[PDB]
Design a protein around this ligand. Structure first.
Ligand SMILES: COc1ccc(C(=O)C2CCNCC2)cc1
Ligand SMILES: COc1ccc(C(=O)C2CCNCC2)cc1
Ligand SMILES: COc1ccc(C(=O)C2CCNCC2)cc1
Length: 460
């Protein structure tokens, strides 16, 4: 039985509005409704992994797991296995996988982050799951961010707290947050960003929706505008939205948006918005293709509609040679040439790098770089040809060209990372000096850049 080089992943997000679901929710897992929908001819083909995020979920874990498993069995005739389930308050993530993947899945982690302080601590936050699928690390975050049209900045803060504090993936990657720990990271949920148009324009917005004219609404979607201004979700992707706003509906129909201010809303308007979203971030030059992104039309127990997204995702096999794992493949090397970091910091410490990769036995610390001043104010840290030659565990190009090197630039004074990034080894050539580049982030914000040249030697 061959190991796969692709899998498909279903991501669902649904704010259930504290109501039990209806008896049939199969349209969700089939990617049927509005938007970028899945072809009917695929209906019986199971996804490899289903990741279900709920918010305002009133069910027990057992109750929801039974509904999910029965749904998938009805669609696919496959009895899915539970990889992980994690709940914080009424925010939940379930990961289900095909039974044939049971020995391909390992290192399963779960965590949660509670957002805000005192007043604001008590129902918002995130849950997450990570695991390895053969040689590929996968992370999944379901967040329910702060509500309210005038709280986009608080949502952005909630995002940064979640990506700082959610403890998933390989704890040895200590300088790296979740935005660098995974081959593929999916972040979804009731992100609660709104269409920022005047209250008076509510009926105009409804008209636009009825005409399926989303362009003048999406141009005011706070998540898109905040992302464009690099305020949130830097270096994440989202498929184009081609479905109607998924909030806020009258229950038991989808014919009416309930937007007007009510005691129950704290006298807030809920103009129709795309609260419910799926975003992703994959390491450079890894295959990831969104094959659906939409909302259901027939699940109406909540004031939100379910959102689905599906992805093709490249995966690699758990490589064994005669040499690695448990020794180097002396036929392999990675040389970082003429490298420099450009940092936005005002500090004057010396910096060193750490190179982290599952192709190394353990992370590698460089010598300190040479600080210079850039022409427009910047700190430039030069490493020259001083960087340590990296010795991968396996030299086979079919393995090595699929790997990635995470880079942290750390202060000598504090050992704190000032910037993190990632370099693909999917090069155009081996034994050839080639340009490399990554932006550097810290706490998911841009802090600088790393650029230079690489020379990769494989056994070919
Ligand atoms: C300290 O305050 C807490 C602690 C736990 C919760 C939960 O909901 C747990 C989280 C993990 N899995 C079961 C449920 C909420 C607030
Ligand atoms: C097919 O879905 C799967 C795949 C893998 C697992 C596991 O590896 C379990 C997880 C808990 N600790 C180790 C065993 C479970 C379900
Ligand atoms: C039209 O509004 C936008 C435009 C761009 C963004 C982005 O952040 C990325 C940039 C890099 N990859 C693709 C899109 C978000 C909203």
């Amino acid at each position: 039985q061959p190991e796969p080089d692709m899998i498909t992943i279903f991501i669902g997000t649904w704010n259930m509005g504290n109501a039990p679901p209806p008896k049939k929710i199969t349209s969700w897992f089939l990617s049927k409704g509005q938007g970028k929908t899945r072809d009917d001819s695929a209906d019986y083909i199971p996804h490899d992994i289903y990741v279900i995020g709920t918010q305002e979920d009133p069910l027990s874990e057992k109750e929801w797991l039974e509904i999910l498993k029965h749904s998938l069995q009805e669609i696919t005739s496959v009895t899915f296995k539970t990889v992980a389930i994690h709940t914080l308050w009424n925010i939940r993530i379930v990961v289900l996988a095909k039974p044939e993947h049971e020995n391909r899945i390992s290192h399963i982690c779960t965590d949660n982050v509670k957002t805000g302080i005192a007043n604001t601590l008590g129902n918002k936050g995130a849950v997450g799951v990570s695991f390895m699928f053969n040689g590929t690390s996968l992370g999944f975050v379901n967040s329910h961010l702060t509500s309210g049209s005038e709280k986009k900045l608080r949502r952005n803060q909630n995002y940064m707290n979640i990506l700082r504090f959610l403890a998933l993936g390989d704890k040895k990657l200590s300088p790296f947050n979740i935005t660098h720990r995974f081959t593929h990271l999916f972040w979804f949920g009731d992100l609660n960003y709104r269409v920022d148009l005047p209250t008076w324009e509510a009926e105009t917005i409804i008209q636009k929706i009825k005409q399926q004219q989303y362009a003048d609404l999406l141009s005011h979607d706070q998540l898109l505008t905040e992302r464009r201004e690099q305020k949130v979700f830097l270096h994440f992707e989202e498929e184009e939205i081609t479905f109607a706003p998924t909030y806020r509906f009258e229950r038991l129909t989808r014919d009416k948006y309930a937007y007007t201010k009510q005691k129950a809303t704290g006298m807030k308007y809920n103009l129709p918005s795309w609260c419910d979203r799926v975003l992703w971030k994959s390491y450079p030059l890894v295959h990831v293709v969104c094959q659906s992104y939409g909302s259901t039309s027939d699940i109406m127990t909540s004031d939100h509609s379910p959102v689905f997204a599906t992805f093709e995702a490249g995966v690699t096999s758990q490589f064994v040679s005669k040499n690695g794992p448990g020794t180097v493949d002396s036929q392999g090397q990675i040389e970082f040439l003429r490298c420099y970091a450009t940092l936005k910091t005002k500090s004057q410490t010396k910096f060193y790098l750490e190179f982290h990769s599952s192709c190394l036995e353990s992370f590698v610390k460089s010598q300190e770089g040479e600080n210079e001043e850039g022409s427009e104010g910047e700190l430039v840290v030069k490493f020259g040809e001083t960087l340590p030659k990296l010795k991968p565990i396996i030299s086979d190009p079919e393995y090595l060209l699929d790997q990635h090197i995470l880079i942290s630039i750390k202060s000598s004074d504090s050992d704190e990372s000032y910037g993190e990034g990632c370099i693909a080894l999917r090069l155009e050539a081996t034994e050839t000096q080639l340009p490399i580049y990554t932006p550097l982030t810290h706490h998911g914000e841009l802090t600088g850049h790393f650029q230079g040249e690489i020379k990769l030697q494989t056994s070919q």
